[PDB]
Design a protein around this ligand. Structure first.
Ligand code: K
Ligand code: K
Ligand code: MG
Ligand code: MG
Ligand code: MG
Ligand code: MG
Ligand code: MG
Ligand code: MG
Ligand code: MG
Ligand code: MG
Ligand code: MG
Ligand code: MG
Ligand code: MG
Ligand code: MG
Ligand code: MG
Ligand code: MG
Ligand code: MG
Ligand code: MG
Ligand code: MG
Ligand code: MG
Ligand code: MG
Ligand code: MG
Ligand code: MG
Ligand code: MG
Ligand code: MG
Ligand code: MG
Ligand code: MG
Ligand code: MG
Ligand code: MG
Ligand code: MG
Ligand code: MG
Ligand code: MG
Ligand code: MG
Ligand code: MG
Ligand code: MG
Ligand code: MG
Ligand code: MG
Ligand code: MG
Ligand code: MG
Ligand code: MG
Ligand code: MG
Ligand code: MG
Ligand code: MG
Ligand code: MG
Ligand code: MG
Ligand code: MG
Ligand code: MG
Ligand code: MG
Ligand code: MG
Ligand code: MG
Ligand code: MG
Ligand code: MG
Ligand code: MG
Ligand code: MG
Ligand code: MG
Ligand code: MG
Ligand code: MG
Ligand code: MG
Ligand code: MG
Ligand code: MG
Ligand code: MG
Ligand code: MG
Ligand code: MG
Ligand code: MG
Ligand code: MG
Ligand code: MG
Ligand code: MG
Ligand code: MG
Ligand code: MG
Ligand code: MG
Ligand code: MG
Ligand code: MG
Ligand code: MG
Ligand code: MG
Ligand code: MG
Ligand code: MG
Ligand code: MG
Ligand code: MG
Ligand code: MG
Ligand code: MG
Ligand code: MG
Ligand code: MG
Ligand code: MG
Ligand code: MG
Ligand code: MG
Ligand code: MG
Ligand code: MG
Ligand code: MG
Ligand code: MG
Ligand code: MG
Ligand code: MG
Ligand code: MG
Ligand code: MG
Ligand code: MG
Ligand code: MG
Ligand code: MG
Ligand code: MG
Ligand code: MG
Ligand code: MG
Ligand code: MG
Ligand code: MG
Ligand code: MG
Ligand code: MG
Ligand code: MG
Ligand code: MG
Ligand code: MG
Ligand code: MG
Ligand code: MG
Ligand code: MG
Ligand code: MG
Ligand code: MG
Ligand code: MG
Ligand code: MG
Ligand code: MG
Ligand code: MG
Ligand code: MG
Ligand code: MG
Ligand code: MG
Ligand code: MG
Ligand code: MG
Ligand code: MG
Ligand code: MG
Ligand code: MG
Ligand code: MG
Ligand code: MG
Ligand code: MG
Ligand code: MG
Ligand code: MG
Ligand code: MG
Ligand code: MG
Ligand code: MG
Ligand code: MG
Ligand code: MG
Ligand code: MG
Ligand code: MG
Ligand code: MG
Ligand code: MG
Ligand code: MG
Ligand code: MG
Ligand code: MG
Ligand code: MG
Ligand code: MG
Ligand code: MG
Ligand code: MG
Ligand code: MG
Ligand code: MG
Ligand code: MG
Ligand code: MG
Ligand code: MG
Ligand code: MG
Ligand code: MG
Ligand code: MG
Ligand code: MG
Ligand code: MG
Ligand code: MG
Ligand code: MG
Ligand code: MG
Ligand code: MG
Ligand code: MG
Ligand code: MG
Ligand code: MG
Ligand code: MG
Ligand code: MG
Ligand code: MG
Ligand code: MG
Ligand code: MG
Ligand code: MG
Ligand code: MG
Ligand code: MG
Ligand code: MG
Ligand code: MG
Ligand code: MG
Ligand code: MG
Ligand code: MG
Ligand code: MG
Ligand code: MG
Ligand code: MG
Ligand code: MG
Ligand code: MG
Ligand code: MG
Ligand code: MG
Ligand code: MG
Ligand code: MG
Ligand code: MG
Ligand code: MG
Ligand code: MG
Ligand code: MG
Ligand code: MG
Ligand code: MG
Ligand code: MG
Ligand code: MG
Ligand code: MG
Ligand code: MG
Ligand code: MG
Ligand code: MG
Ligand code: MG
Ligand code: MG
Ligand code: MG
Ligand code: MG
Ligand code: MG
Ligand code: MG
Ligand code: MG
Ligand code: MG
Ligand code: MG
Ligand code: MG
Ligand code: MG
Ligand code: MG
Ligand code: MG
Ligand code: MG
Ligand code: MG
Ligand code: MG
Ligand code: MG
Ligand code: MG
Ligand code: MG
Ligand code: MG
Ligand code: MG
Ligand code: MG
Ligand code: MG
Ligand code: MG
Ligand code: MG
Ligand code: MG
Ligand code: MG
Ligand code: MG
Ligand code: MG
Ligand code: MG
Ligand code: MG
Ligand code: MG
Ligand code: MG
Ligand code: MG
Ligand code: MG
Ligand code: MG
Ligand code: MG
Ligand code: MG
Ligand code: MG
Ligand code: MG
Ligand code: MG
Ligand code: MG
Ligand code: MG
Ligand code: MG
Ligand code: MG
Ligand code: MG
Ligand code: MG
Ligand code: MG
Ligand code: MG
Ligand code: MG
Ligand code: MG
Ligand code: MG
Ligand code: MG
Ligand code: MG
Ligand code: MG
Ligand code: MG
Ligand code: MG
Ligand code: MG
Ligand code: MG
Ligand code: MG
Ligand code: MG
Ligand code: MG
Ligand code: MG
Ligand code: MG
Ligand code: MG
Ligand code: MG
Ligand code: MG
Ligand code: MG
Ligand code: MG
Ligand code: MG
Ligand code: MG
Ligand code: MG
Ligand code: MG
Ligand code: MG
Ligand code: MG
Ligand code: MG
Ligand code: MG
Ligand code: MG
Ligand code: MG
Ligand code: MG
Ligand code: MG
Ligand code: MG
Ligand code: MG
Ligand code: MG
Lengths: 60, 45, 77, 92, 102
RNA sequence: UAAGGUGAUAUGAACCGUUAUAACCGGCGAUUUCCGAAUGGGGAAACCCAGUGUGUUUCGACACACUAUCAUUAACUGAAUCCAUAGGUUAAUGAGGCGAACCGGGGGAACUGAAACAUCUAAGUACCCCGAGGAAAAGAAAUCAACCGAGAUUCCCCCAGUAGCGGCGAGCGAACGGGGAGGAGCCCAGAGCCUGAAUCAGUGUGUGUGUUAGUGGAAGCGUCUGGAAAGGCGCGCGAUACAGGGUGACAGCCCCGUACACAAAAAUGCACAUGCUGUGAGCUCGAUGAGUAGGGCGGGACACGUGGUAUCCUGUCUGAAUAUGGGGGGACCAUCCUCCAAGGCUAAAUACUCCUGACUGACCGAUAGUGAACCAGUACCGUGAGGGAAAGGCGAAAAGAAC
RNA sequence: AGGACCGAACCGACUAAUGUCGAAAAAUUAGCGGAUGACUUGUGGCUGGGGGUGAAAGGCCAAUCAAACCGGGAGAUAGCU
RNA sequence: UGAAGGUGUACUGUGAGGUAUGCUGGAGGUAUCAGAAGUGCGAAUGCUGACAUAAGUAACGAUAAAGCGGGUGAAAAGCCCGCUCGCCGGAAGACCAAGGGUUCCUGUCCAACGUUAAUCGGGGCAGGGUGAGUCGACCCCUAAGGCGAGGCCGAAAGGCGUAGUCGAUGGGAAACAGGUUAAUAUUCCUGUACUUGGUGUUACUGCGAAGGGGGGACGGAGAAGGCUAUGUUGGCCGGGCG
RNA sequence: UACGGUGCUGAAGCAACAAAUGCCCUGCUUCCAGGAAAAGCCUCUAAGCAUCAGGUAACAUCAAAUCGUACCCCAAACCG
């Protein structure tokens, strides 16, 4: 996914960060503690996918 | 019948604390010793 | 500190030998005096803490020549 | 007002008797917040993420319990809870 | 460069199951393979309350050391040592004596 | 590189992969909470509290940067006071703290020995402080020598427990000279004709050939005991590989290595060309370090304790000649000899090992070896500085004992 | 008014018995002295080792004091056991 | 086809010793002649661990005191419920500070810890529980005192100290009643309040410190007067007729 | 009635007298040993500034962050 995310606009790449934070991380974090979430692996890969983006948009 | 240790955390820290040790040339060497020995509790804090 | 500004004479140590050669530690302090020197270059008095031998170096050389050497080391006066 | 960071404040909803009794009778929600997380930040976060009308947020810091097991001592992390009172327009 | 690997027919060189053959289920990090129908150990599996609770003895396939097994040739009809060579761009294994590729 | 991966106690759950976009190992980055020199002010370290500007914002306010001190440097500027100076402003650059030993300096004991003890010794030792560097100090003769000669310094071996010093006691103890390691010299106190030439100096720069990942890497078989064979016995085979470790007992040939042959997209350490912001040889001519050498006084250093005491250093008071000049040759003098002080710089041989890599031990094997083989500077003890333990091993495999 | 009187709290510590491997490395019990003063006590500060402090006893300075405690010189030295 | 070690036995040398072997043990051992030593233990009020003895002895921590019935339970003198009895009550009650640091509360468990037992516990194991504009800290000011740009002084380290800046135990805005949780409440709830700021409109109008002044703002003792907290007795109210 | 209670109702809800070491009282008399400081607070103006900026009231609206809050506390939870 990195090779695909690298070719993106600086304004457009924030929307993926905000989409990763808005739902996904928050939603899975709230859903995990309530005991509704079976798939625990999603918490890990989302956190890594944020890091990827937040690394990628540090171009200056 | 009244023993020697009559605790007070203000007194404790003002007397033996990290900043109390940092303040002085000799107090900095104490820390340098405890670090050199490799102590977990460097001061009482 | 008891240090001549001109020569750099500071207090050396040594013994104080008795008739029976009992070595007791002492110090030899230099003959320091705060003295005002007229600097004729810029028309003013300059106060310097100098040894009696300092004064003789200032007499031998020029006060300005000594102040030139003082300014090179990074001193005040 | 503090976009992106508001998402990191609310950790989880708290589950207990005291938490439950305060749902129906007091109209509040108890929840685990970040160790930072001011009452304004918790309010503003609930106002956006949960999207409900917040009356007032009360907050406290819970101290971690020293669980000694086997032969080693180990203390839990200090976590902050927030009793968030809701207005009459309520749900969850 | 592991010589014994996942889908590979082996033969046992040492141990109570000396001479038997089987496929490797999985190699471990410690340097031990689990070959099927080899080290059959009769474990006493305790009936754990949560999830399944069968309550009975079971013949598990225990691990064996990698150096106790060698890959089966299926041509000579016996154990054979493995090598490594560069056929084409990629690296591949080969049998020492009767130099074929796996 | 890769067919098993998601570190450990330590499993589970949910997953992730298989010829490469899983993991794994390196090079270069990105992130890098708070404290801590801690540096915006404070503070009972991991906290409290701001200023200034900037940029958005729904009244509420968010975000990021700056803002310590000091020392040089520069511009604004600038009081008593005419001129300036003191001072005050911001900016440029640097410093600050930590760390094993080794190193150079500033200070500097005592127990002890002297069969007591005070000179002396222990000893410029322990310790304290300051400042460095990969080494540091020294260092290119105002040095020795003995009428012969040598030629900076440091380090090793002798000289030699010698000559000396010494309540001539205890003790301290050279030098000359010789053999070795290692070698190297220069620059200012400046005019000449002429000048970028020797030189060391930016940095690129191809280079070499190391370092940080790695790749290949030979040849075993049947029987006999046995839980298990690597062991016994029989037949082989490799060996620039029989170092070593693992494997159910002791394996050259089962595995991992090994000898050996190799290997870099990227970062770096060295060793030769080398364009050069930026740097002068050779000449002639000169000059050639003054409160200095020396002295008196008091101390200290020299093996040398004031002794007949040279030489060196300087707290103190003095005070030359300055190359037909002066220093030294162990009081001192006269001849002879030798050097050029009062300004600097300089690699190697030398010391050390917090730390990194490999290898080695007539070194230890759990009361030993580190205090610490084990989650130890831990538990624990002390207000504190600080002190400071005990505690290794089921089995080949958990097959860790269903019922 | 009072370094006045009697007397609880509070500060003390004269007598006795108990206790002395204690309940306690200084206490208990019953009596006892002061109790508006040179009183007492909380909280925080300051004074440091030949030094402090001392209505003075060589008392006190973390259960240690005719020279604290910790680390170092250090395996001081011991014609002694 | 059984090493070292452990444990017996039998021989054997003048001795220290040596040899052979049964059992245990389950992988090491080592002739010979040489070489080197952390080379031999009964004592050192030796050092560390283990284990005895006294001894099933003293003791079981205030002479405030228990008793019974029922309950749970493998088991009850001690835990739970009940009823009597007892003891404190200027405390042995009830709130705090300091200091501890989860001991709180709930469920559960009784190995160890509790000077006995334990179903119990401040014990083990899980899970809960600490809600503030007004209470406290923070902040604002300062005391003693600490630090301290410049500075003055000191071999170095550092000492003192100015401007400042810290430093409460002191000064400085405001919340009360009742209700509620197994465990917090001046914090939650309900009912009534209050304070200091920021920010818009109106009607006015002479405002502004590093400065001046006021205030904050202060001792011992004593004596009186008025009050209240509070208590007592009637009154009223609800039960009561033993 | 899980024997726990719990929602509902809920009578009187006055007067006298006594009374503090509390409060008025940081008062009052009184004495000698002669009894913090600094901000908050009110006030006054310089340097400044004049349809400004500020103040003032009445009002509306926001804002009041952060950390402590359990429990023991003359004690089995502190110092021994
Ligand atoms: K010594
Ligand atoms: K009763
Ligand atoms: Mg960045
Ligand atoms: Mg103190
Ligand atoms: Mg030191
Ligand atoms: Mg230490
Ligand atoms: Mg500590
Ligand atoms: Mg001496
Ligand atoms: Mg004057
Ligand atoms: Mg509220
Ligand atoms: Mg709070
Ligand atoms: Mg933790
Ligand atoms: Mg690999
Ligand atoms: Mg699944
Ligand atoms: Mg990738
Ligand atoms: Mg990649
Ligand atoms: Mg990092
Ligand atoms: Mg600071
Ligand atoms: Mg900065
Ligand atoms: Mg800076
Ligand atoms: Mg700061
Ligand atoms: Mg404070
Ligand atoms: Mg200038
Ligand atoms: Mg002016
Ligand atoms: Mg002027
Ligand atoms: Mg700056
Ligand atoms: Mg800069
Ligand atoms: Mg420096
Ligand atoms: Mg430095
Ligand atoms: Mg040195
Ligand atoms: Mg040194
Ligand atoms: Mg030295
Ligand atoms: Mg010296
Ligand atoms: Mg002596
Ligand atoms: Mg002596
Ligand atoms: Mg002697
Ligand atoms: Mg003697
Ligand atoms: Mg004597
Ligand atoms: Mg020295
Ligand atoms: Mg030192
Ligand atoms: Mg230093
Ligand atoms: Mg080197
Ligand atoms: Mg360098
Ligand atoms: Mg050098
Ligand atoms: Mg030099
Ligand atoms: Mg020289
Ligand atoms: Mg020269
Ligand atoms: Mg020459
Ligand atoms: Mg020469
Ligand atoms: Mg000749
Ligand atoms: Mg020659
Ligand atoms: Mg020679
Ligand atoms: Mg004599
Ligand atoms: Mg000597
Ligand atoms: Mg000697
Ligand atoms: Mg010769
Ligand atoms: Mg020769
Ligand atoms: Mg020589
Ligand atoms: Mg030579
Ligand atoms: Mg050599
Ligand atoms: Mg050479
Ligand atoms: Mg040579
Ligand atoms: Mg050479
Ligand atoms: Mg030459
Ligand atoms: Mg030369
Ligand atoms: Mg000159
Ligand atoms: Mg090469
Ligand atoms: Mg390989
Ligand atoms: Mg191989
Ligand atoms: Mg067979
Ligand atoms: Mg067979
Ligand atoms: Mg046979
Ligand atoms: Mg058989
Ligand atoms: Mg069998
Ligand atoms: Mg075999
Ligand atoms: Mg055999
Ligand atoms: Mg043969
Ligand atoms: Mg071999
Ligand atoms: Mg075995
Ligand atoms: Mg053999
Ligand atoms: Mg073989
Ligand atoms: Mg081997
Ligand atoms: Mg062989
Ligand atoms: Mg080679
Ligand atoms: Mg390359
Ligand atoms: Mg390549
Ligand atoms: Mg490259
Ligand atoms: Mg010269
Ligand atoms: Mg000169
Ligand atoms: Mg001379
Ligand atoms: Mg002289
Ligand atoms: Mg002379
Ligand atoms: Mg001379
Ligand atoms: Mg002289
Ligand atoms: Mg004379
Ligand atoms: Mg003289
Ligand atoms: Mg002299
Ligand atoms: Mg003398
Ligand atoms: Mg001498
Ligand atoms: Mg003599
Ligand atoms: Mg004589
Ligand atoms: Mg002479
Ligand atoms: Mg000359
Ligand atoms: Mg000449
Ligand atoms: Mg000449
Ligand atoms: Mg002459
Ligand atoms: Mg001459
Ligand atoms: Mg000479
Ligand atoms: Mg000489
Ligand atoms: Mg002469
Ligand atoms: Mg002579
Ligand atoms: Mg001589
Ligand atoms: Mg001589
Ligand atoms: Mg002469
Ligand atoms: Mg000269
Ligand atoms: Mg010459
Ligand atoms: Mg000279
Ligand atoms: Mg010279
Ligand atoms: Mg000289
Ligand atoms: Mg000189
Ligand atoms: Mg010279
Ligand atoms: Mg150099
Ligand atoms: Mg070199
Ligand atoms: Mg070797
Ligand atoms: Mg060997
Ligand atoms: Mg060894
Ligand atoms: Mg061993
Ligand atoms: Mg050990
Ligand atoms: Mg052992
Ligand atoms: Mg042991
Ligand atoms: Mg130790
Ligand atoms: Mg402690
Ligand atoms: Mg063991
Ligand atoms: Mg094991
Ligand atoms: Mg094992
Ligand atoms: Mg069993
Ligand atoms: Mg009086
Ligand atoms: Mg009285
Ligand atoms: Mg009377
Ligand atoms: Mg009486
Ligand atoms: Mg009391
Ligand atoms: Mg008493
Ligand atoms: Mg007493
Ligand atoms: Mg009597
Ligand atoms: Mg009695
Ligand atoms: Mg007794
Ligand atoms: Mg007794
Ligand atoms: Mg009594
Ligand atoms: Mg009486
Ligand atoms: Mg009486
Ligand atoms: Mg009386
Ligand atoms: Mg007291
Ligand atoms: Mg105090
Ligand atoms: Mg003090
Ligand atoms: Mg002393
Ligand atoms: Mg001392
Ligand atoms: Mg002193
Ligand atoms: Mg004194
Ligand atoms: Mg007194
Ligand atoms: Mg006496
Ligand atoms: Mg004492
Ligand atoms: Mg005494
Ligand atoms: Mg003494
Ligand atoms: Mg003494
Ligand atoms: Mg002490
Ligand atoms: Mg030593
Ligand atoms: Mg001794
Ligand atoms: Mg047999
Ligand atoms: Mg046999
Ligand atoms: Mg045999
Ligand atoms: Mg046997
Ligand atoms: Mg047998
Ligand atoms: Mg046997
Ligand atoms: Mg052995
Ligand atoms: Mg034997
Ligand atoms: Mg037996
Ligand atoms: Mg026996
Ligand atoms: Mg035998
Ligand atoms: Mg047998
Ligand atoms: Mg056996
Ligand atoms: Mg073994
Ligand atoms: Mg072995
Ligand atoms: Mg062997
Ligand atoms: Mg043997
Ligand atoms: Mg041998
Ligand atoms: Mg030897
Ligand atoms: Mg021995
Ligand atoms: Mg013995
Ligand atoms: Mg023994
Ligand atoms: Mg033991
Ligand atoms: Mg009994
Ligand atoms: Mg008896
Ligand atoms: Mg008896
Ligand atoms: Mg008894
Ligand atoms: Mg008893
Ligand atoms: Mg009793
Ligand atoms: Mg009883
Ligand atoms: Mg029943
Ligand atoms: Mg029953
Ligand atoms: Mg039961
Ligand atoms: Mg029953
Ligand atoms: Mg039952
Ligand atoms: Mg039953
Ligand atoms: Mg039963
Ligand atoms: Mg019963
Ligand atoms: Mg009962
Ligand atoms: Mg009882
Ligand atoms: Mg009861
Ligand atoms: Mg009850
Ligand atoms: Mg009573
Ligand atoms: Mg009463
Ligand atoms: Mg309270
Ligand atoms: Mg405690
Ligand atoms: Mg705590
Ligand atoms: Mg606990
Ligand atoms: Mg409880
Ligand atoms: Mg139970
Ligand atoms: Mg039992
Ligand atoms: Mg247990
Ligand atoms: Mg018990
Ligand atoms: Mg006991
Ligand atoms: Mg319980
Ligand atoms: Mg508990
Ligand atoms: Mg608050
Ligand atoms: Mg109040
Ligand atoms: Mg405070
Ligand atoms: Mg604040
Ligand atoms: Mg203020
Ligand atoms: Mg302040
Ligand atoms: Mg003051
Ligand atoms: Mg101050
Ligand atoms: Mg100061
Ligand atoms: Mg400044
Ligand atoms: Mg300065
Ligand atoms: Mg200063
Ligand atoms: Mg002065
Ligand atoms: Mg100071
Ligand atoms: Mg001041
Ligand atoms: Mg306070
Ligand atoms: Mg207040
Ligand atoms: Mg207050
Ligand atoms: Mg209030
Ligand atoms: Mg109330
Ligand atoms: Mg109510
Ligand atoms: Mg109600
Ligand atoms: Mg409570
Ligand atoms: Mg309300
Ligand atoms: Mg209302
Ligand atoms: Mg109303
Ligand atoms: Mg109202
Ligand atoms: Mg009011
Ligand atoms: Mg208001
Ligand atoms: Mg005022
Ligand atoms: Mg007051
Ligand atoms: Mg008064
Ligand atoms: Mg009176
Ligand atoms: Mg009256
Ligand atoms: Mg009255
Ligand atoms: Mg009333
Ligand atoms: Mg009332
Ligand atoms: Mg009545
Ligand atoms: Mg009736
Ligand atoms: Mg009757
Ligand atoms: Mg009831
Ligand atoms: Mg009345
Ligand atoms: Mg009363
Ligand atoms: Mg007044
Ligand atoms: Mg006001
Ligand atoms: Mg007004
Ligand atoms: Mg609001
Ligand atoms: Mg609010
Ligand atoms: Mg409470
Ligand atoms: Mg209570
Ligand atoms: Mg209680
Ligand atoms: Mg209480
Ligand atoms: Mg008491
Ligand atoms: Mg109580
Ligand atoms: Mg005790
Ligand atoms: Mg206790």
């Amino acid at each position: 996914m990195k090779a695909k995310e690298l070719r993106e606009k600086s304004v457009e790449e924030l929307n993926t960060e905000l989409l990763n934070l808005l739902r996904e991380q928050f939603n899975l974090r709230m859903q995990a503690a309530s005991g509704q979430l079976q798939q625990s692996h999603l918490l890990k890969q989302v956190r890594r996918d944020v890091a990827r983006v937040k690394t990628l948009l540090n171009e200056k | 019948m009244k023993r020697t240790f009559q605790p007070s955390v203000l007194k404790r820290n003002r007397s033996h604390g990290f900043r109390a040790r940092m303040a002085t040339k000799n107090g900095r060497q104490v820390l340098a010793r405890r670090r050199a020995k490799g102590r977990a509790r460097l001061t009482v804090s | 500190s008891r240090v001549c500004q001109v020569t750099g004479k500071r207090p050396v140590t040594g013994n104080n030998r008795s008739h029976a050669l009992n070595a007791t530690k002492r110090r030899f302090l230099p003959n320091l005096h705060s003295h005002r020197f007229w600097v004729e270059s810029e028309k003013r008095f300059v106060t310097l803490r100098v040894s009696a031998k300092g004064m003789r170096v200032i007499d031998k050389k020029g006060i300005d020549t000594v102040l030139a050497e003082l300014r090179a080391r990074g001193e005040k006066y | 007002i503090r976009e992106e960071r508001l998402l990191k404040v609310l950790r989880a909803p708290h589950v207990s008797e005291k938490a439950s009794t305060a749902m129906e009778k007091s109209n509040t929600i108890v929840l685990k917040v970040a160790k930072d997380a001011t009452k304004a930040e918790i309010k503003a976060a609930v106002q956006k993420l949960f999207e409900v009308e917040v009356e007032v947020v009360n907050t406290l810091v819970v101290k971690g319990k020293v669980k000694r097991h086997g032969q080693r001592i180990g203390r839990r992390s200090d976590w902050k809870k927030a009793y968030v009172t809701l207005k009459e327009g309520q749900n969850l | 460069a592991a010589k014994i690997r996942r889908d590979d027919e082996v033969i046992v060189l040492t141990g109570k199951d000396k001479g038997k053959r089987g496929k490797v289920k999985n190699v471990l990090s410690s340097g031990k393979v689990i070959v099927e129908g080899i080290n059959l150990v009769k474990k006493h599996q305790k009936p754990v309350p949560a999830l399944n609770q069968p309550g009975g003895i079971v013949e598990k396939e225990a691990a064996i050391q990698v150096s106790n097994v060698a890959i089966f040739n299926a041509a000579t009809g016996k154990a054979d040592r493995v090598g490594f060579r560069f056929e084409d761009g990629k690296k591949v294994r080969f049998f020492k004596s009767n130099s074929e590729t796996i």
